[PDB]
Amino acid sequence: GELNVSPFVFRENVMVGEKVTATCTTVTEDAQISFKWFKNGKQINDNEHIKVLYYTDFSLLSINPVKADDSGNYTCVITAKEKSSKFTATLTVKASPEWLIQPENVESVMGSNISLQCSVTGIPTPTINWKKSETSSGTDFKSLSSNAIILPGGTLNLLRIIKSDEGLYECQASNGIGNDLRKTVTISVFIP
Amino acid sequence: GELNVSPFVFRENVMVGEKVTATCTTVTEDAQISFKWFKNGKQINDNEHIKVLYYTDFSLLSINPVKADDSGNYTCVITAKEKSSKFTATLTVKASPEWLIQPENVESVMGSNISLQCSVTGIPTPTINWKKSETSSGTDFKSLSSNAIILPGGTLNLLRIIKSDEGLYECQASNGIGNDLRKTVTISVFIP
Ligand SMILES: *[C@@H]1O[C@H](CO[C@H]2O[C@@H](C)[C@@H](O)[C@@H](O)[C@@H]2O)[C@@H](O[C@@H]2O[C@H](CO)[C@@H](O[C@@H]3O[C@H](CO)[C@@H](O)[C@H](O)[C@@H]3O)[C@H](O)[C@H]2NC(C)=O)[C@H](O[C@H]2O[C@@H](C)[C@@H](O)[C@@H](O)[C@@H]2O)[C@H]1NC(C)=O
Ligand SMILES: *[C@@H]1O[C@H](CO[C@H]2O[C@@H](C)[C@@H](O)[C@@H](O)[C@@H]2O)[C@@H](O[C@@H]2O[C@H](CO)[C@@H](O[C@@H]3O[C@H](CO)[C@@H](O)[C@H](O)[C@@H]3O)[C@H](O)[C@H]2NC(C)=O)[C@H](O[C@H]2O[C@@H](C)[C@@H](O)[C@@H](O)[C@@H]2O)[C@H]1NC(C)=O
Ligand SMILES: *[C@@H]1O[C@H](CO[C@H]2O[C@@H](C)[C@@H](O)[C@@H](O)[C@@H]2O)[C@@H](O[C@@H]2O[C@H](CO)[C@@H](O[C@@H]3O[C@H](CO)[C@@H](O)[C@H](O)[C@@H]3O)[C@H](O)[C@H]2NC(C)=O)[C@H](O[C@H]2O[C@@H](C)[C@@H](O)[C@@H](O)[C@@H]2O)[C@H]1NC(C)=O
Ligand SMILES: *[C@@H]1O[C@H](CO[C@H]2O[C@@H](C)[C@@H](O)[C@@H](O)[C@@H]2O)[C@@H](O[C@@H]2O[C@H](CO)[C@@H](O[C@@H]3O[C@H](CO)[C@@H](O)[C@H](O)[C@@H]3O)[C@H](O)[C@H]2NC(C)=O)[C@H](O[C@H]2O[C@@H](C)[C@@H](O)[C@@H](O)[C@@H]2O)[C@H]1NC(C)=O
């Protein structure tokens, strides 16, 4: 003779552009209930790419297409004539890397410090690592370790460049979601 | 440009008499789909305490009230004009112990072998253990370990009974679900 909201869960790997549903019902049939949905304690109302379907014994929350904004806790509250119960589940929208500043081919003078921007956006925030050809056919790629500093935002700083610093450089962006972003650029060094 | 059934799960602790739902939808909106539900590869059809609700972008399976028979794998199949996809989740209905043969007060002759039946039903199948008062006020209870054999089905066999075997005996039935079943009986031994 009690009232319990049946637990609901969102699927693990939800990504932007996909569809997300959530179903709220009671554990034992009561047939005298009403529903209300909330995001972070604030009530959700049926419009705006978020649609709430009300039925006799269940309610459906629908988010389509989902954006990164839709992350948060979603709560259903059931009211049956004397008592109200709730259940809350957390939705985390993920996204594969997207380009923000692509790297570029550069031609700079010997002895100069240069920066190569490779910044992306995604959830979780992607990791950027840089590799160099060290062979101009450009099939082999190796990691970088003296005058090469990768700044935390994915920018490669090459200090006091010389002819050996020429070659093909590739930055890789990955957060374990979707496909990785990759882009190769050539660095030329010249005497002024 | 593919078709994936969004995963669905049943709640952990489903018990007989409760209600069970399942929602089938696509990962990405397609709007050109149809639904069919199956239990153990055999199609479910809307009647008989199992009702299937069909809508434009989702379908709902409803089992209310659920019985132990309803355990099994439940599969939703979505068809969109060229391709069909599926998802399967396993439902296991549980139940607290219910009495099948309660123990009884017995009065038997010295030197006889007697059996005390304490058999229950439940899912998972419950464990039965026996305890003796060893004090007729009947507040303290202890386990049993020479002429006391508990047979695997919860029956307590007391061999060659004597006056010391008199007292209050209690069998306990538990499977970790709901409430345990308990029942105390008195054993009298007499000379013929
Ligand atoms: C989504 O929900 C999680 C946990 O789910 C529970 O939410 C809490 C508040 C209870 O209502 C439970 O019944 C729900 O199941 C939240 O994470 C919790 O946030 C609480 C903040 O109110 C934390 O409690 C605080 O803890 C400190 C330190 O002990 C204490 O001094 C405070 O008084 C206060 O009680 C709690 O520890 C959090 N637990 C976990 C597992 O995270 C989410 O809110 C929070 O999310 C975390 C990751 C941070 O970003 C917080 O800044 C944020 O408030 C909640 N999210 C939203 C959007 O509501
Ligand atoms: C090329 O890069 C080097 C070092 O790396 C720098 O990277 C640039 C892009 C900036 O992000 C800097 O903030 C990094 O440090 C520069 O040489 C460094 O210059 C710093 C000061 O301008 C030095 O810091 C000093 O170090 C002393 C001794 O260790 C310390 O006590 C002080 O706190 C002081 O801050 C730093 O040590 C230098 N690098 C190394 C490896 O020692 C280049 O610029 C500068 O070169 C220095 C030595 C001076 O002559 C400056 O006038 C000159 O601008 C930078 N640009 C070039 C080479 O054109
Ligand atoms: C409910 O589903 C589980 C597992 O879920 C999967 O079902 C299998 C068959 C695949 O379709 C997957 O894609 C689903 O996710 C079943 O458990 C499996 O049963 C299979 C029987 O066909 C087992 O495969 C067999 O394995 C032997 C030994 O390696 C092999 O030689 C055979 O050729 C055959 O491939 C498989 O190993 C099982 N896996 C697990 C994790 O249990 C359920 O069916 C089975 O349930 C088990 C507990 C036993 O009772 C079996 O007798 C029973 O068939 C399935 N239940 C129902 C009612 O369909
Ligand atoms: C009271 O219980 C004892 C032993 O426990 C029995 O429990 C009853 C309820 C039944 O489930 C039996 O199957 C259990 O064994 C009985 O005495 C046992 O009798 C068995 C044969 O009837 C003996 O098995 C034998 O043992 C020898 C030597 O070890 C072995 O080589 C053989 O294979 C042979 O099968 C068993 O050993 C006895 N118990 C003990 C502890 O040794 C009581 O009944 C019987 O008492 C025996 C000794 C004979 O006199 C039978 O004619 C008599 O019916 C049983 N009922 C009473 C005491 O009234």
Author numbering:
A (entry chain A), B (entry chain A): 1 to 145, 148 to 194
Text of the article:
Recently, a shortened Dscam (sDscam) gene family with tandemly arrayed 5′ cassettes in Chelicerata species has been identified, which encodes ∼50–100 isoforms. Chelicerata sDscams could be classified into two subfamilies, sDscamα and sDscamβ, containing one and two variable Ig domains, respectively. Crystal structures and cell aggregation assays demonstrated that both α and β subfamilies of sDscam used Ig1 for the isoform-specific trans recognition in a hand-in-hand manner. Furthermore, the cis interactions were established by the three FNIII domains of sDscam, which assemble into a cross fold with a kink between FNIII2 and FNIII3.
The trans interactions of Chelicerata sDscam were mediated exclusively through the Ig1 domain for both sDscamα and sDscamβ subfamilies. It is worth noting that sDscamβ subfamily has two variable Ig domains, Ig1 and Ig2. The crystal structures of sDscam Ig1 from both M. martensii and L. polyphemus revealed a common assembly of antiparallel homodimer for both α and β subfamilies of sDscam. Similarly, sDscam Ig1 also employs the ABED face to form an antiparallel homodimer. However, among the seven Ig1 structures reported here, the complementary electrostatic potential surface pattern (negative in one end, neutral in the middle, and positive in the other end) has been only observed in the three β isoforms, but not in any one of the four α isoforms.
